[PDB]
Amino acid sequence: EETRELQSLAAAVVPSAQTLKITDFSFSDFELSDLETALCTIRMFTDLNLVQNFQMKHEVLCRWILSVKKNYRKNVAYHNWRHAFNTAQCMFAALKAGKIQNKLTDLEILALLIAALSHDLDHRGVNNSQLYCHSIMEHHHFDQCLMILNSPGNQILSGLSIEEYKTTLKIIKQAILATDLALYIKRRGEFFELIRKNQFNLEDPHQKELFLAMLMTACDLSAITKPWPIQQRIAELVATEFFDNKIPSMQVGFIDAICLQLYEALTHVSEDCFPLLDGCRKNRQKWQALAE
Ligand SMILES: CCCCCCCCc1nc(-c2cc(S(=O)(=O)N3CCN(C)CC3)ccc2OCC)[nH]c(=O)c1Br
Ligand SMILES: [Mg+2]
Ligand SMILES: [Zn+2]
Numbered sequence: 001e002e003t004r005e006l007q008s009l010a011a012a013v014v015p016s017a018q019t020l021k022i023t024d025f026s027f028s029d030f031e032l033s034d035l036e037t038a039l040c041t042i043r044m045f046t047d048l049n050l051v052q053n054f055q056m057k058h059e060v061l062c063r064w065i066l067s068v069k070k071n072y073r074k075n076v077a078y079h080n081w082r083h084a085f086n087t088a089q090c091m092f093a094a095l096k097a098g099k100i101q102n103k104l105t106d107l108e109i110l111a112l113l114i115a116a117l118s119h120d121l122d123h124r125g126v127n128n129s130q131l132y133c134h135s136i137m138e139h140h141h142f143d144q145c146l147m148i149l150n151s152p153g154n155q156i157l158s159g160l161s162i163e164e165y166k167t168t169l170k171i172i173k174q175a176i177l178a179t180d181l182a183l184y185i186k187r188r189g190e191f192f193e194l195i196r197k198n199q200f201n202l203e204d205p206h207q208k209e210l211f212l213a214m215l216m217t218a219c220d221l222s223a224i225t226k227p228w229p230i231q232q233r234i235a236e237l238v239a240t241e242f243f244d245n246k247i248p249s250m251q252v253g254f255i256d257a258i259c260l261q262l263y264e265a266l267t268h269v270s271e272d273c274f275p276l277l278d279g280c281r282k283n284r285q286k287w288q289a290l291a292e
Pocket of ligand 1: 178180181184217220223224235236238239247250251254
């Protein structure tokens, strides 16, 4: 039932990005089977021109996607394959519809897509899990990512040169590390401060790296931006993982403390990322109304 899954995936037709709606910031995955998410994931790679520019063989990409999917735990309510899949979908939408793509190199785009998909690998749940605060969990996710990338039949980066490979690995690792909330909160001020003074510049390597970090977090939290019926559903998953009527005020606090400023910053960098900011605002209104 495993080469069977790979067999079906590799033989399947891959519908267009438009058809699959993966270009929409409002995308949801509730009605999709695992096979269909795999198909959407192929489409993200091919439409970012990654299959072409880095010579990936179809059967390798398919095997790699299936390995990644398999190394998330289904019994974990929120931190599972569908979350990673959604995080990647948002990266794709921000690159395409949000027009971030033109601001980045091909290697950067390759790394973010892989990192988005891999960023929570083997997660066991926020409770089912350090005093050092050295991003232990994120190191483990990257380690898992690297292992899958090096597995026989799964080497989607085999087509890159040695120098290519090292730089993309570095970006992938920084990107996954960035998804540690502690790190996001540390580095936030700098990003906000820079945009505040109109001093933000992507040509500076350091600010470029800072932006990739912020982008990762924006995609990671992207459920908070979804249409109301979708956000309510995802909040339901987050709630069961966390505690495996006080929820509305919690959601408002979360949106204020962590989310709103990020999506505001993102829209300054790219106007077309506005729908994430807008969606987050509409959700704040809805949760706040419930808070009474
Ligand atoms: C890069 C992001 C880091 C990992 C974050 C893990 C999950 C994020 C999340 N967290 C919350 C949330 C966050 C909080 S909280 O105020 O930040 N808080 C979080 C830590 N906790 C053990 C106590 C409560 C409380 C309730 C929440 O949701 C209940 C439905 N809500 C969300 O919609 C989302 Br999405
Ligand atoms: Mg994480
Ligand atoms: Zn995550």
